[PDB]
Amino acid sequence: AWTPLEPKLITRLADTVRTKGLRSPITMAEVEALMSSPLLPHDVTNLMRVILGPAPYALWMDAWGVQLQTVIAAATRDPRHPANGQGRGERTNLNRLKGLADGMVGNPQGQAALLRPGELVAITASALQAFREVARLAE
Amino acid sequence: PWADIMQGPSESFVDFANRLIKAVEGSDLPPSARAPVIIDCFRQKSQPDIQQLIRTAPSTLTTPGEIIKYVLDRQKTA
Amino acid sequence: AWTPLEPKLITRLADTVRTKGLRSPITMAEVEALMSSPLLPHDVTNLMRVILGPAPYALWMDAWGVQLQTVIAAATRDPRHPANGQGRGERTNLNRLKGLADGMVGNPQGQAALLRPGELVAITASALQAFREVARLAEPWADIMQGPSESFVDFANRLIKAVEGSDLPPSARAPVIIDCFRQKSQPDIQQLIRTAPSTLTTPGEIIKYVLDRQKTA
Amino acid sequence: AWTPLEPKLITRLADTVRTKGLRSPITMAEVEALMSSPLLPHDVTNLMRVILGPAPYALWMDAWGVQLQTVIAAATRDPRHPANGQGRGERTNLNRLKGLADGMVGNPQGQAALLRPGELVAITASALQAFREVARLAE
Amino acid sequence: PWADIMQGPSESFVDFANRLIKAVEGSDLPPSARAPVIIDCFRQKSQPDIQQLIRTAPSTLTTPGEIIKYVLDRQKTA
Amino acid sequence: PWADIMQGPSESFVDFANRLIKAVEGSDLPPSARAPVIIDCFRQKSQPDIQQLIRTAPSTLTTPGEIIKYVLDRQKTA
Amino acid sequence: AWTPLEPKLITRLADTVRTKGLRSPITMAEVEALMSSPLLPHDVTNLMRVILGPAPYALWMDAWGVQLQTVIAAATRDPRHPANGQGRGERTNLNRLKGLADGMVGNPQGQAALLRPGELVAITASALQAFREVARLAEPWADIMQGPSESFVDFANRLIKAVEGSDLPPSARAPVIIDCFRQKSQPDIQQLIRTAPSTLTTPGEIIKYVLDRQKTA
Amino acid sequence: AWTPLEPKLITRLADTVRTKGLRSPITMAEVEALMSSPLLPHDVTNLMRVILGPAPYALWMDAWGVQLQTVIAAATRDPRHPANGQGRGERTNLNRLKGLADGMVGNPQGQAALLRPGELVAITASALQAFREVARLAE
Amino acid sequence: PWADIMQGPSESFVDFANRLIKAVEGSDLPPSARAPVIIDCFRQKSQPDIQQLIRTAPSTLTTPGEIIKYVLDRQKTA
Amino acid sequence: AWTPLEPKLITRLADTVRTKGLRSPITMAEVEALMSSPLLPHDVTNLMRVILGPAPYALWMDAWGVQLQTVIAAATRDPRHPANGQGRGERTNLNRLKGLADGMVGNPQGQAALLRPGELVAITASALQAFREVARLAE
């Protein structure tokens, strides 16, 4: 069952990003805090939509896609990925990682249903690395 | 109005991009016409130093995020 | 059946050659226009007799003979010429190309009867190349610079014209055109070509790149 | 049997391109007019040689090659191309499209003999699209 | 009259060749006698600078067109 | 002192590069820290025309020699 | 056994580079002189450290690396390189060429021990080509004319120098040199080359012909 | 074992050629001096590359080739050439004289290995005669 | 004296050749030294028009008779 | 047995050539007269030495050699030459035509001994054609 993040925490994090900036160690610590439980693509996408401005959000979408593509290359380079399965029918496509696959587009409940925990942690680590890249790039 | 937005002589590029994307997405354009307009406004606004920086791009930039990344990489630190 | 070219078109072309000259691109375009259908040796000979003066006509006869001789050398070097046949009895002699063979001298009808379409197109291409040679001869690439106000397509046209209509070998035109694009073409375009993330190895590619990334002004 | 285009029409079209330019709607209409019947590679090649300057002609050769390559990719992606046949022996190579194949180099009569009507219309549409690209690029 | 044609002191060579070929071809000579006459008139008319230029031709020129081409190549630009 | 070296308004770039490389290599830095320092001093010193010239480099320059070559190629002849 | 180059010769060469510059033919001759015996990476590296300033030395390190990489690509493209061996265990890595391999870093004696003579000559030729590149870079062929008073061998030397030390491909230098001999080289020599009963198809042949038939003055 | 010529002697000879010219008797004496021991094609080629300018070097390459061709004609006219052998398998090709044969291109050590002393002296005499021709031709 | 013979400004070439060959063959030179001397006197005497005519000979002339034939062919008729 | 031509006739012919020139029809008639009987190479050589000046004599030697070479080419193109024989041992070399062969150099008696009548008439016709060429060339 999907539970959304508190809008109070999200508002506090957005104001933190607004006053301290993207690169302060306190901001990265707060992001790591709100990045503790494995989030669904819907959660991370809406979170970055709210806390980041338009141009940093575009940059972050780009960087997140690139990092997820590196993850999928490593996944096709190793059939023992915690997102993959043993047979070929469990291979994870980027539509399933970005939340674009069938039964997931716009629906967080179905998303949480079909996604694997390894998928969730890989998406989360990818999003964190992308946030770091964009923060280092913006300023 | 999005079509009246210019990058000021002293303004940074991320502020200009923020203002432009805000005014373009919060306007009466269809959703499928925002990215091309944002790109073509990056190219024609954004005072001639960045205009020439985008013009002489050895790669083809086909997304506002890619243009922003390229300009932030190769911008004149000042 | 042979049909002559209109004397009205020929008169207009002659006046074009008289006012614009032999080398203008409009004149070459008009010649290409009147060189559209494959002409018989009689047609091309009379056409050059009318549009060209006496001395350019002598030069053109010389050049046409030389080009036809090159064609006949290539023909004896390949029995599959569209003017040739499979057996040795269809080999095409220069008397048949210049219209001097038996049953053709002075008679355009018999000419059109015995000639092949491959013969006609070879004669026509030879005459066009000879006209180009004589035009380049009747009236320097390393002195061409892009003017401060000149556009880039005009400069490229002028440079390619002067390089291809010169004494260089055919295998040395592309490198020279590239290296002249790089060193001429005033320093804005010079730096635009220098900072090319890709390697441009053809004049067409350089032209496309410069036209894409040029400073609109 | 091959019939050449009138040099009078070609001269008028060349002067139209000379005065109005490459991109005027009247020029594109005139080109569409002279692009009505399916032309052989020889015809289109000589036409572009006469009406276009040297540099636009180089650009047009490039663009025509690229568009013909896209056509040949679509042709190998569908064995029911009006240029293709049913068996593998009728597959159309770029040497046959550009007029470079055996029995065609420099000879328009043989060209018209071996070429298919689907081949002719594909070559013609490719040349028209290439002309549009070069016209949009030159100015 | 073809046999009275001289290249003037200030006249160019292409004008002289045009005038001479015109007067020789529009005359009473047989068709098979025009080329040798045109050549021998190029050699003896065409004031002594071009006369010596044609005389000292390392190759043998056997056609009016070839003589015209050679002279146009090696002529004294003035 | 290397961190006090600026390219003068009238100084050429090869003289500035010579002076900077001299002062950086003849200093107390470790050997593995000279190239990054020389690069980052080329980028932040070397008055804003060359700063923008290095910033808008379509390629990534990862060596002082490559930066010197690029700047010498695309420098404003004056 | 490794023997160092004389510091007297190195001091004289450094002062030569200081007064004459990097591109003078006397400087290149002196470098060729001190580049006679195959040098170890240590020798060439210290030599360029001493004779070149800091910025030319950085440029030269870059160019030397690039040329050595081209050499190693040719070496992996041919197992019969005089630096390579027959088996795969003798393949030469760039650490062994630049002197960075094990047992060589900072030690010229061990360097001379493990290196091959083919390795040494390849390193030396690479360093010479890199020096030429940097010299051409530190300080235009289509602007070269033969002066009214200049001899022809000086003009040919200057032209061949500027054409070979330029951005042209290697396969485009001879045609360009020929066509520049024909269009430059003031009209007396122009007519001398034009009226050549033989066809001259090489810069050396043109130079020989012109030197034979030139107007002694 | 191959030993290179001293760059000091080569520098002195280059300056001699630079000040006195190509045709002075002192210059020819110096060349004869540095032409004392039989040189490998590599040595003579680099020597002429250093002491001669570009255009005299082209002329000298031409003349050296012509003289070597005359030598090879005399060699095929007499099987008792000090460069030849008794059987047909020792016949000396121009690739072996100019240093272009297999195992010699760019490698002076292998060159010195496979070359004969008669080959070396013939190459040396040919190079000396070519130098004389070019010197008589240049001025 | 053979070494004092020059071709006069108005003298024809066959007269000059006759005079020179006469004076060279009726002199104190060895028989094996007459042809080279006659050739080298044709080249250095024989006023600069014929000098340049002999200099620009696409073929190599190695006999006085061949030089005489060539000059008589390509001489400036006047 | 060899009989020399009268020095009186030769003196009269020399004065004819001196006053009338080389190309007058009377001079050619006189030469044809003194060219009536087949002459030995010695006779024609001395005749041209006496009647012609030095430069015309050089030209005539050249032209005579060229014409004799054409004759020898025709002779090797037809084994039925009146100078040739049936076997290969009678083939006529240019040393035998120019009088340079063994037993002929400087000796007119031996010349007349070994020469054939066909050889004599061929030499004579060659000399006459060479005289015509030189006469047409001199003026």
Burial bucket for residue G140 (CB in 10 Å: 0-12, 13-18, 19+): exposed
**Strands of chain G, DSSP E:** none
The three state secondary structure string of chain F is: CHHHCCCCCCCCHHHHHHHHHHHHHCCCCCHHHHHHHHHHHHHHCCCHHHHHHHHCCCCCCCCHHHHHHHHHHHCCCC
Find the helix packing angle between E64-74 and E48-55, rounded to 10°: 110
Phi, psi of B46 (to 5 degrees): 65, 80
Host domain of residue E64: 2-74
Cβ-Cβ contacts under 8 Å for D133 (sequence gap 6 or more): D63, D67
E53: closest CA of chain I, how far (Å): 8
3-state SS, residue D24: coil
3-state SS, residue G167: coil
- Using CB atoms, which chains have 3+ pairs under 8 A with E? C, G, I
Structure tokens at A115: 């996604």
CA distance linking residue A79 with residue A110, whole number of Å: 25
Q: Do E58 and G195 touch (CB under 8 A)?
A: yes
CA distance linking residue B10 with residue G187, whole number of Å: 60
Number of domains in chain D: 1
G172: closest CA of chain C, how far (Å): 6
Distance of CA C64 to the CA centre of its chain: 12
CA distance linking residue G184 with residue G150, whole number of Å: 12
Q: Among all chains, which residue has been given the structure tokens 């307009």?
A: B37
CA distance linking residue G189 with residue G63, whole number of Å: 39
| In a shared domain, residues C111 and C172 | no
Q: Is I3 on the interface with J (CB under 8 A)?
A: no
Among A4, A122, A138, smallest CA distance to A64 is for A122
Among D119, D70, D74, smallest CA distance to D97 is for D119
Q: Do B64 and A53 touch (CB under 8 A)?
A: no
- Using CB atoms, which chains have 3+ pairs under 8 A with F? B, C, G
E strand or H helix at A36: none
Is the distance from CB of I2 to CB of I23 less than 8 angstroms? yes
Structure tokens at A111: 């998303």
Phi, psi of G21 (to 5 degrees): 100, -175
Structure tokens at B28: 């009466």
CA distance linking residue C24 with residue C1, whole number of Å: 34
Would you state the torsion angle of the CA atoms of residues F9, F12, F16, F17, taken in this order, to the nearest 10 degrees? 140
Q: Do D55 and C30 touch (CB under 8 A)?
A: no
Size of interface A-B (CB pairs under 8 A): 33
Q: Which residues of E touch C106 (CB under 8 A)?
A: none
Among H78, H58, H122, H74, smallest CA distance to H96 is for H122
Nearest-CB residue to G197 (from I52, I55, I58): I58
CA distance linking residue I14 with residue D62, whole number of Å: 66
Is the distance from CB of D84 to CB of D73 less than 8 angstroms? no
Among G157, G208, G209, G215, smallest CA distance to G187 is for G215
CA distance linking residue J105 with residue J122, whole number of Å: 19
CA distance linking residue D55 with residue C208, whole number of Å: 10
Maximum CA extent, chain G = 65
DSSP at C93: P
Q: Is E59 on the interface with G (CB under 8 A)?
A: yes
Q: What was the resolution (in A) of this experimentally determined structure?
A: 6.7
CA distance linking residue I43 with residue I68, whole number of Å: 11
Among G162, J54, B74, smallest CA distance to I35 is for J54
Is the distance from CB of G119 to CB of G83 less than 8 angstroms? yes
How would you classify residue G212: left for phi > 0, otherwise alpha for psi between -120 and 50, otherwise beta? alpha
Q: State whether the Cα torsion J111-J115-J120-J123 is positive or negative.
A: negative
| In a shared domain, residues C7 and C88 | yes
- Using CB atoms, which chains have 3+ pairs under 8 A with H? G
E strand or H helix at A138: helix A117-138
If contacts are CB pairs under 8 Å, which of residues 109-138 in chain J contact chain I?
Answer: 137-138
E strand or H helix at I37: helix I34-44
Q: What's the CATH code of the domain at B66? A: 1.10.1200.30
CA distance linking residue J44 with residue J111, whole number of Å: 13
Q: Which residues of E touch C54 (CB under 8 A)?
A: 17-18, 21-22, 25
CA distance linking residue H45 with residue I29, whole number of Å: 44
Structure tokens at G167: 């951005």
What long-range pairs does H98-104 form, CB within 8 A, spacing at least 24? H98/H41, H98/H65, H98/H68, H99/H40, H99/H41, H99/H42, H99/H45, H104/H41
E strand or H helix at E32: none
Is the distance from CB of G92 to CB of G119 less than 8 angstroms? yes
Is the distance from CB of C112 to CB of C4 less than 8 angstroms? no
Q: Is G194 on the interface with E (CB under 8 A)?
A: yes
CB atoms within 10 A of CB D98: 17
Cβ-Cβ contacts under 8 Å for C128 (sequence gap 6 or more): C31, C32, C35
CA distance linking residue G3 with residue F71, whole number of Å: 39
Breaks following residues of chain D (C-to-N distance > 2.5 Å):
none
| In a shared domain, residues C46 and C70 | yes
* DSSP string computed for H120-131: HHHHHHHHHHHH
Q: What's the CATH code of the domain at D19? A: 1.10.375.10
Structure tokens at A55: 């141009």
Q: Is F73 on the interface with C (CB under 8 A)?
A: yes
CA distance linking residue D7 with residue E56, whole number of Å: 45
CB atoms within 10 A of CB A120: 22
- Using CB atoms, which chains have 3+ pairs under 8 A with B? A, C, F
Is the distance from CB of E2 to CB of E16 less than 8 angstroms? no
Structure tokens at J67: 């014409």
Which technique was used to obtain these atomic coordinates? cryo-EM
Give whole-number Cα distances, G90 to D112, G76, G81, G100, in Å: 61, 11, 10, 16
Single-letter amino acid code for the residue at J26: I
CA distance linking residue D62 with residue D52, whole number of Å: 14
Q: Is G61 on the interface with F (CB under 8 A)?
A: yes
Q: Do G191 and E74 touch (CB under 8 A)?
A: yes
Q: Which residues of C touch B59 (CB under 8 A)?
A: 197
**Strands of chain E, DSSP E:** none
Is the distance from CB of A123 to CB of A97 less than 8 angstroms? yes
Q: Do C197 and F73 touch (CB under 8 A)?
A: no
Breaks following residues of chain E (C-to-N distance > 2.5 Å):
none
| In a shared domain, residues C101 and C77 | yes
**Strands of chain C, DSSP E:** none
Find which of I11, I14, I62 to mutate to test the J interface (most J CBs within 10 Å of its CB).
I14
Maximum CA extent, chain D = 49
Question: Closest chain G residue to H57 measured between Cα atoms?
Answer: G204
Single-letter amino acid code for the residue at H109: Q
CA distance linking residue C92 with residue C82, whole number of Å: 10
Is the distance from CB of G122 to CB of H105 less than 8 angstroms? no
Q: Among all chains, which residue has been given the structure tokens 């003078």?
A: G24
Q: Which residues of C touch F59 (CB under 8 A)?
A: 197
**Strands of C10-145, DSSP E:** none
Q: Do chains A and F touch (3 or more CB pairs under 8 A)?
A: no
Burial bucket for residue G141 (CB in 10 Å: 0-12, 13-18, 19+): buried
Q: Do chains G and B touch (3 or more CB pairs under 8 A)?
A: no
CA distance linking residue J59 with residue G167, whole number of Å: 55
The three state secondary structure string of chain B is: CHHHCCCCCCCCHHHHHHHHHHHHHCCCCCHHHHHHHHHHHHHHCCCHHHHHHHHCCCCCCCCHHHHHHHHHHHCCCC
Is the distance from CB of F53 to CB of F28 less than 8 angstroms? no
- Using CB atoms, which chains have 3+ pairs under 8 A with D? C
Q: Which of G82, G103, G138 is the last residue of a domain?
A: G138
Q: Do F51 and B78 touch (CB under 8 A)?
A: yes
Is the distance from CB of A60 to CB of A47 less than 8 angstroms? no
Phi, psi of C28 (to 5 degrees): -65, -35
Q: Which residues of A touch B35 (CB under 8 A)?
A: none
CA distance linking residue C25 with residue C14, whole number of Å: 15
Distance of CA A47 to the CA centre of its chain: 9
Single-letter amino acid code for the residue at A133: E
* DSSP string computed for G52-97: S-HHHHHHHHHHHHHHHHHHHHHHHT-TT-TTS-SSGGGPPPHHHH
Single-letter amino acid code for the residue at F47: Q
DSSP at C122: H
CA distance linking residue D124 with residue D117, whole number of Å: 10
Q: Which residues of G touch F18 (CB under 8 A)?
A: 53-55
Q: Which residues of G touch H109 (CB under 8 A)?
A: 82, 117-118
**Strands of D55-127, DSSP E:** none
Burial bucket for residue E40 (CB in 10 Å: 0-12, 13-18, 19+): exposed
Q: Is E48 on the interface with I (CB under 8 A)?
A: yes
Among E65, E69, E70, smallest CA distance to E21 is for E65
Give whole-number Cα distances, H111 to H98, H114, H116, in Å: 10, 6, 10
Give whole-number Cα distances, E5 to C57, E38, E47, G19, G209, in Å: 20, 11, 11, 67, 39
Question: Closest chain C residue to F76 measured between Cα atoms?
Answer: C187
| In a shared domain, residues G184 and G85 | no
Distance of CA C46 to the CA centre of its chain: 19
Q: Among all chains, which residue has been given the structure tokens 């050059």?
A: C48
| In a shared domain, residues C147 and C89 | no
DSSP at A100: -
Is the distance from CB of D127 to CB of D58 less than 8 angstroms? no
Nearest-CB residue to G176 (from C172, C183, C184): C172
CA distance linking residue D7 with residue C55, whole number of Å: 26
Is the distance from CB of I65 to CB of J59 less than 8 angstroms? yes
Among C74, C124, C79, C63, smallest CA distance to C97 is for C124
Is the distance from CB of C11 to CB of C21 less than 8 angstroms? no
Question: Closest chain G residue to I54 measured between Cα atoms?
Answer: G213
What long-range pairs does G200-205 form, CB within 8 A, spacing at least 24? G202/G174, G202/G178, G202/H62, G203/G156, G203/G160, G203/G174, G203/G177, G203/G178, G203/H55, G203/H58, G204/H58, G204/H59, G204/H61, G204/H62, G205/H62
Q: Among all chains, which residue has been given the structure tokens 């400036």?
A: I76
Among A4, A85, A12, smallest CA distance to A46 is for A4
| In a shared domain, residues G96 and G4 | yes
Nearest-CB residue to G197 (from E58, E73, E74): E58
Distance of CA D82 to the CA centre of its chain: 16
Q: Is C199 on the interface with F (CB under 8 A)?
A: no
Is the distance from CB of C171 to CB of C138 less than 8 angstroms? no
Q: Is C215 on the interface with B (CB under 8 A)?
A: yes
C86: closest CA of chain D, how far (Å): 13
Find which of F44, F55, F67 to mutate to test the B interface (most B CBs within 10 Å of its CB).
F55
DSSP at D89: G
Among C172, C174, C210, smallest CA distance to C190 is for C210
Q: Which residues of E touch C55 (CB under 8 A)?
A: 14, 17-18, 21, 68
Find which of B14, B59, B63, B71 to mutate to test the A interface (most A CBs within 10 Å of its CB).
B14
F20: closest CA of chain C, how far (Å): 26
Q: Do chains G and C touch (3 or more CB pairs under 8 A)?
A: yes
Question: Closest chain B residue to F55 measured between Cα atoms?
Answer: B74
CA distance linking residue A37 with residue A31, whole number of Å: 12
Burial bucket for residue G110 (CB in 10 Å: 0-12, 13-18, 19+): middle
DSSP at C40: P
| In a shared domain, residues G1 and G34 | yes
E strand or H helix at D88: none
Phi, psi of D98 (to 5 degrees): -75, 0
CA distance linking residue E78 with residue G38, whole number of Å: 58
CA distance linking residue A42 with residue A65, whole number of Å: 14
3-state SS, residue E4: helix
Q: Is C53 on the interface with E (CB under 8 A)?
A: yes
CA distance linking residue A115 with residue J24, whole number of Å: 119
Among G207, G28, G38, smallest CA distance to G125 is for G38
Q: Is F78 on the interface with C (CB under 8 A)?
A: no
Question: Closest chain B residue to C189 measured between Cα atoms?
Answer: B56
Nearest-CB residue to C197 (from B52, B55, B58): B58
CA distance linking residue G173 with residue G182, whole number of Å: 14
CA distance linking residue B53 with residue C213, whole number of Å: 10
Is the distance from CB of E46 to CB of E54 less than 8 angstroms? yes
CB atoms within 10 A of CB J114: 12
Among G61, G183, G191, smallest CA distance to G134 is for G61
Q: CA-based Rg of chain D, rounded to a whole angstrom?
A: 15
* DSSP string computed for H49-106: HHHS-HHHHHHHHHHHHHHHHHHHHHHHT-TT-TTS-SSGGGPPPHHHHTT-STTTTT
DSSP at J54: H
Q: Do B75 and F55 touch (CB under 8 A)?
A: yes
CA distance linking residue I41 with residue F58, whole number of Å: 69
CA distance linking residue A88 with residue H47, whole number of Å: 68
CA distance linking residue G208 with residue G194, whole number of Å: 15
Q: Is A21 on the interface with B (CB under 8 A)?
A: no
Among H5, H128, H12, H139, smallest CA distance to H60 is for H128
Give whole-number Cα distances, I59 to A83, D55, D123, I40, J134, in Å: 86, 44, 55, 16, 20
